[PDB]
């Protein structure tokens, strides 16, 4: 597995049981109430899926889809985003935006 970084969620990495991203005065949290909440910005945000599932978890795939599945892998919310296959990263930026970026079009070495 891949070493967590505070404000990044690379493809493959998984948040749950309120694992959370942090960046200064913001967090984005894959809670236990199955709800993906961004505390931050002026008004924050949520996937709005309060208790629409049990044991949930957020996960970004290798085609830019950011998804919340439950314990038995039922999609609870998606970003409904998709592009080429490869490594993507979600950032929690200092401005409080949470944006996905990808794929890897240039790296410093393989």
């Amino acid at each position: 597995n891949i070493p967590f970084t505070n404000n990044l969620l690379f493809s493959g990495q998984v948040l749950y049981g309120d694992g959370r991203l942090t960046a200064k005065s913001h967090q984005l949290v894959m809670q236990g109430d199955c709800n993906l909440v961004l505390y931050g910005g002026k008004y924050g945000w949520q996937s709005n899926t309060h208790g629409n599932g049990e044991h949930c978890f957020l996960r970004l795939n290798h085609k830019g889809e950011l998804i919340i599945k439950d314990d038995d892998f039922k999609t609870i919310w998606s970003s409904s985003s998709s592009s080429k296959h490869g490594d993507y990263v979600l950032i929690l930026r200092d401005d409080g935006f949470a944006v996905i970026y990808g794929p890897a079009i240039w790296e410093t070495s393989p």
Binding site: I2, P3, F4, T5, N7, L8, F10, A23, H26, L28, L38, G40, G41, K42, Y43, G44, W45, G64, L66, S79, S81, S82, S83, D87, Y88, V89, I91, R93, D94, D95, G96, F97, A98, V99, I100, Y101, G102, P103, A104, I105, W106, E107, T108, S109
Partner: protein
């Protein structure tokens, strides 16, 4: 900028750091961009001064010297968009994009 990211439109100024764990990318003052413990550098040492690292809207990291002159390019490109160079915890600098999805806590409706 962000301590480990650089957004297209943002600049990693002279002597600037982006850092993640044991890996330290520096836009040094000998105009060489070096990622420390990353086995890699722009190899633009002495090739100018007051240099800057930038990110274009097509995914290129362009090193402009003091005034305006380009000194190094990634020479990898894509569509027009917001991009991100980020220091990967496994020790690479990797350009990412463009943006596929965006969450905006800064909008009333």
């Amino acid at each position: 900028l962000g301590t480990n990211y650089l957004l297209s439109g943002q600049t990693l100024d002279r002597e600037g750091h982006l850092k993640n764990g044991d890996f330290d990318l520096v836009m040094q003052d000998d105009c060489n961009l070096v990622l420390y413990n990353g086995n890699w550098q722009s190899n633009t040492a002495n090739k100018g001064r007051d240099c800057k690292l930038t990110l274009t809207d097509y995914g290129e990291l362009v090193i402009k010297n003091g005034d305006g002159s380009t000194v190094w390019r990634s020479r990898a490109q894509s569509v027009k968009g917001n991009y991100a160079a980020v220091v990967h915890p496994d020790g690479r600098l990797v350009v990412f994009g463009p943006s596929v999805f965006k969450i905006d806590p800064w909008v009333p409706g």
